[PDB]
Symmetry: C4
Subunit: 389 residues, 4 copies
């Protein structure tokens, strides 16, 4: 049976802790993959953490991080949410140095990108076997989102970028059924930049909050309809949520253009709430440290600066990183709306700390009907480690 | 299908060994979580051991026990009963430094408390996803039982405390269906103290034997009806079963008030048997060492001192700790009563032994129709360990 | 659905390798329980290896074998046949320093004996929970077989001994349905000795070949009918198959009495084949080294010395140990007879080798319609190990 | 339900990455079997990697590779495709120093060969238990293919060799249903040599591309019909694909005879594509390094040298090894043809590198409708390892 996912996103007043994997603390002694991107996606039976491994373990010499990001060894794997990315519980998914994954209600579909920068291949898997491919259309690091893709009534959707990471690139919507491409669309976005989209289903559409790695410190926003027509622009709110970024006071919002005139970025997310938005961001404006989520009244549709809620989940003394969106399937939450959820990656090691390696662990939060107090569910590993000596 | 759990508790003459996990002995070399509270709860398919981890492994530097009890890293996880709390067999349950869990016959419901002492959040999970929350109502370490909660005909019940741990606090009964709160009640108990309840279903009610951490060396007793009306008081028996406590000879029982005038305590349990009671306690009156279970004739309803049975399961040369109640589901035992069962936590390390760490393992016993001989199923680990050097 | 197991044992001309777990070789680096008695029993879905652990791992200090045989820590656990007794694949079964286990077609029934020598308790488990008990009836090390018990048409049968291990003891047949004792019988056997029976179903009866630890170098034989009437005696064959034992030439067989006048023994097995018997034994007459299986024509019913087949599975340069019987369920083999099968335990360490520890691994063989060549599937571990230094 | 496997092989323009296990990189720290032959075979539910272990782990002294190839310890085991051959995820299959395995749609059938060189035994397993045997018919190392066997409409087929490995030997087709031999055939092939066949189903027949270890640098080709009649010869293409071999320019193809006049070989594969063939081979003509797959137009039926496609998957700077064929079941791919797939073993250690041990890892590729760019998914382990010092 296909998941509908046609419902509204739940209006939430805050976010409750779902899981914490403690991967790096455990990896001090246990057998844990070195990873990045521990994103979460759910079937109607369970939620899983997906991740990119380098084929190496924490506290081992192969965790030497001199080896390139897009290596022959990178592979998408997964465990149940809350479990560490340990070897002995891991399900293999795809060969990938960039990835996305989602469930249509019957099976898991994953997409793994590997191969050379100049001509990469994305391999779509469905139910445990490859079913289709997408080759690089523009010859420059074909790449996906690094979070959950989005299945609505049996058809699944995701966004891909091919081209420069610090200039104008090319962006495409892909649609598949049962692991087979049934439609695609070019995203016209001159002046704009789209990387690493965080999507969720809402009102029968796919909504995505992405990363501008060119000039924007506000986040691009894509709203995809089932027929592949779309709306694209920026998160209207007059508060920047990318990193690096300037102060809130020095920012004017925009629904259409990138603002802030800064390079770089970090993958992030946001949730529409009628006309409001929940927006994640690191606490530091310059570093990937701390994590907070703000509700901006009318921030989805207006250049609003009306901040009505603020919740801290990782304090500014602690390293964060990537963040992404997913929803709880109706079959699991028991609700008649789509509970909005996010994961926060917590990066340990290089370049901020004195080790030969880099990994991350995660905390996952789910939208609830109540205000939830500030705290810090930080990584907690004690660095440096044994191999670092 | 919901479990009825409307049956009488079985009248038992003694207790047979169910399981022993040997976690710490195994953790000398294997990959085992450092834990506390290895409580047991059963679905109609199996019984699982739940536990609190600190995100660290035995024989690893992160097992340094200087890190606070209620830390960002603590997480409720579980394995099948008898298995060590090893990483590679563990199911993730909830972020929690205090917890309870039980099965309604369809799915597992768990409750995990985390967040700051002044404003803690309890996150209810049902079928693997968070479904509801309870925030601290009195601002002082919201906390649950650390043993199995209790599901009767599809509705599940548990007790929570918020407030001082050595003075008058506030106590509440919570009721949920399918992970959603459908009722609650304040427990009026002036002069009394309720911590860490050990509950079981009996005659269509929930009966709880708890821990008075204020002045009582006898144990408080709560009897909860489905409509949330209740009876609360103390275990009538003229024999104290908390720790620390005085000698039996210097004790007068009470059905209504705390007796003994001593602070502190340890989580424990008892089982109604008509008007008799089975009561667990450590053998030492001052230390958490040894474990014995006594049957007191008319000890549930009278200030009785008539001890008619005594069974030792952990000798006084060996460390014990927490103890808690659960029942065998009718679907598993094949009986028409609810087989009463308990677990005994066996704490190793600080503060009694010369190590940097603290963990525990467990032995689980189930009520049988026969007298069972004294023995000692103690932890057995050889301390100190490698990191302790 | 209950297994019938009412069929004839298959007539076989030899034995084919089923599995080898390589536990000790793997345990040089992996996380493997120290064990003894790796017996095999099958459900209609799979065959599992059961074993006794001491709660310790190979290459760890807790594997120090100074700790008593019948310790508080011993526990019955299991894995699928061919898998090493590693921690992370192990299913917990029972607290036990002596054990038996079998499947009735619906669930697993196990029996674990633990507690003090003077008053031991045997706890019967059914479907993962304890369901019944047997206390020591004669006060001297209550104990079972250490191999598969036997289920026929839903009722399961096993043999137990209580009393001296080197003199006249007491022996009993037990019968259970769904983990509940429904019948028992005393075995009258003056002059005889029964230990560690290896049973299988055949023609609607349970046949057992056991170990005389008193004076017999031939093996006692018990044939149990469903109503608990029985036939008891010795394996008629004029060839001794216990260890230690004398030469074949110096032996006269007996159907009724122990022959050989020697103490000690080793658990072993045999299979009726019409009037023939397959009999296992170590190759050495004095040591537990080597393993061979002989077919003696008319050896079940006559003092025959007519040896018609001989197959070696472990050469005399290599350590063996215990051996036991089980059958392939009809639902798995696809046959209309009960394929006879055995396991050979291979003991490494003390007292024969220079280590602080003792464990064993196994090879499992199944009866086939063809003559199978001699070879040696010995343990293969390289001793001593790391902790031994 | 039996798998049909009566469909045509899909015509493919190239091959997409399916999985990479990274076993040796992981085995630097994790608990990974030392293996060879990581072949892949699929049920309608999943694809598994099968492998031969020596009962030892990477980075352990038992991985000393002085121990013979056909040892008492070798055992066929399996994991899901993409997973490392780690202990704690491994399913035991058979005792074997040579093996094959395939799924008929209901259960797994495996065949494991063990025992002495002069009189080996092959034990057929079906659904987890041995069901039949084949003894050596010619007394000289009975042996199978080391890749997936082939099930068509419930009957499974495989090729076996018995006799010299560098001269004329004897070759046989075996056919089984439900693990029971129902037919066999001798392969008449004077002057020819057949080893280690790589088979797949195509048009209702089994097609096999094998290894001539006698004089052929081209590969023998066997086409088996359900009634055991067959066609046997050499891959017609005028391009040699065994290793060692000469240059392409110095080669004339043959449909009937071995060409090249060289000894030795390596297991390989090829796929019929109408009259074309996809042929795998190492890049080096003399070493097992690099891996490429070529499409030769009319190369199945003619001495063609018309190379129309070439795809590199392992570069010539990196070690390869064995390679083998399997297909995606229709139930998994969703197609109406049989997606052709292969695995490439990547051997690390002796004799090419300075270590005491030898293992391999793998990359698996599946046929797709698009041209896929050259890359190198090599093993990646950093040698030597810890025990090598
Ligand atoms: C701008 C996003 C992307 C463009 C190539 O680059 C990712 C940046 C980045 C980071 O931590 O900021 C980490 C990434 S996320 C990923 N898959 N691996 C990375 O190292 C970069 N992505 C790729 C495919 O190289
Ligand atoms: C009186 C029970 C409770 C009150 C805060 O304190 C627990 C005492 C205690 C002990 O071993 O005695 C261990 C506990 S049980 C638990 N969850 N962790 C602990 O360290 C204390 N509970 C909390 C939430 O901090
Ligand atoms: C004669 C069988 C039994 C009588 C107490 O003693 C077993 C002998 C023995 C051996 O290797 O010979 C090993 C055993 S088998 C087992 N369960 N553990 C052992 O150490 C002995 N059994 C007991 C319950 O102590
Ligand atoms: C020619 C194939 C076979 C003939 C005995 O010998 C295999 C050669 C070989 C190699 O890497 O080239 C490795 C093999 S494949 C295998 N099962 N083990 C090996 O060591 C050889 N096979 C046997 C049964 O010994
Ligand atoms: Ca940016
Ligand atoms: Ca107290
Ligand atoms: Ca004897
Ligand atoms: Ca050759």
């Amino acid at each position: 049976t296909y998941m509908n996912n046609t419902e509204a996103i739940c209006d939430v007043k805050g976010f409750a802790p779902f899981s914490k994997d403690n991967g790096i603390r455990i990896g001090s002694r246990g057998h844990i993959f070195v990873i990045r991107e521990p994103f979460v996606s759910c079937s109607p039976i369970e939620c899983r953490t997906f991740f990119l491994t380098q084929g190496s373990l924490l506290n081992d010499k192969h965790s030497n991080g001199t080896v390139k990001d897009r290596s022959p060894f990178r592979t998408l794997m997964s465990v149940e949410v809350g479990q560490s990315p340990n070897v002995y519980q891991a399900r293999f998914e795809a060969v990938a140095w960039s990835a996305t994954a989602c469930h249509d209600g019957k099976k898991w579909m994953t997409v793994g990108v590997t191969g050379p920068d100049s001509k990469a291949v994305a391999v779509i898997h469905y139910g445990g076997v490859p079913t289709d491919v997408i080759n690089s259309w523009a010859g420059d690091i074909l790449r996906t989102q690094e979070s959950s893709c989005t299945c609505i009534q049996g058809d699944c959707y995701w966004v891909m970028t091919d081209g420069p990471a610090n200039r104008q690139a090319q962006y495409r919507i892909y649609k598949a059924n049962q692991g087979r491409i049934i439609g695609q669309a070019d995203i016209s976005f001159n002046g704009g930049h789209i990387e690493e989209c965080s999507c969720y289903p809402n009102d029968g559409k796919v909504e995505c909050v992405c990363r501008d790695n060119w000039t924007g410190t506000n986040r691009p926003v894509l709203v995809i309809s089932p027929d592949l027509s779309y709306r694209v622009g920026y998160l209207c709110a007059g508060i920047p949520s990318d990193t690096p970024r300037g102060e809130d006071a020095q920012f004017t919002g925009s629904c259409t253009s990138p603002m802030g005139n800064q390079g770089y970025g970090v993958k992030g997310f946001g949730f529409r709430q009628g006309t409001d938005v929940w927006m994640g961001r690191t606490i530091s404006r310059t570093s990937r440290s701390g994590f907070e989520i703000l509700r901006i009244k009318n921030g989805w549709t207006q250049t609003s600066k009306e901040q009505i809620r603020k919740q801290v989940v990782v304090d500014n003394l602690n390293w964060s990183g990537y963040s992404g969106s997913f929803t709880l399937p109706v079959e699991l939450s028991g609700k008649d709306c789509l509970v909005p959820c996010f994961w926060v990656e917590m990066i340990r090691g290089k370049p901020e700390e004195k080790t030969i390696w880099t990994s991350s662990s995660s905390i996952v939060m789910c939208g609830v009907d109540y205000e939830v107090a500030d705290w810090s569910w930080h990584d907690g590993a004690i660095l440096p480690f044994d191999i670092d000596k």
